[PDB]
Design a protein around this ligand. Structure first.
Ligand code: NAG
Length: 167
């Protein structure tokens, strides 16, 4: 199940956001670099903070990510399936991918069992809906942009290392 924008009380995007070419062959994991969360109520708060941060501080039109995965094993909708994320700050990457952002800092600490499980369910749901190509790669944002320090999670990316679609 998905906590939708209207369920976590998302601000509207400060401007219109371009649509994404579907289906997408690349799915990109990123750390949110905020505190993590165990329940839906605290996760709701986290997501609202990141939207506010992304708009006020980072100067994006909206929360950067397509989806956010909380430590409670829930999926929080940022821009969603059909809008273009701003995760890589690079039009070439962002126009050909989806971002799954993991609520937390994961240089050392691991994502929870639930964070990993729902990732699988989410990738599956995306293939069924025709948002993700069956031949997709799931990969690390630090691999795509090695000099960007905001993408280094490392303990997050190790958890996916031996998944089949992982690169
Ligand atoms: C969140 O991170 C803390 C470390 O600050 C850890 O002890 C805790 O178990 C984590 N909780 C979840 C659900 O990820």
């Amino acid at each position: 199940d998905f906590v939708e924008r209207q369920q976590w009380l998302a601000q509207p995007p400060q401007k219109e956001i371009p649509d994404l070419e579907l289906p997408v062959g690349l799915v990109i994991a990123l750390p949110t670099n905020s505190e993590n969360c165990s329940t839906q109520a605290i996760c709701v708060l986290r997501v609202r903070l990141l939207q506010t941060y992304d708009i006020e501080s980072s100067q994006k039109c909206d929360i950067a990510y397509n989806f956010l995965i909380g430590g409670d094993g829930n999926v929080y909708v940022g821009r969603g399936w059909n809008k273009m994320g701003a995760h890589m700050n690079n039009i070439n990457y962002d126009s050909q991918s989806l971002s799954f952002a993991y609520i937390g800092s994961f240089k050392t600490i691991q994502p929870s069992a639930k964070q990993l499980s729902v990732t699988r369910l989410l990738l599956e749901r995306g293939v069924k809906l025709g948002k993700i190509a069956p031949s997709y790669r799931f990969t690390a944002s630090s691999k795509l942009m090695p000099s960007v320090t905001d993408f280094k999670a490392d303990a997050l990316y190790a958890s996916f290392a031996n998944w089949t679609h992982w690169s």
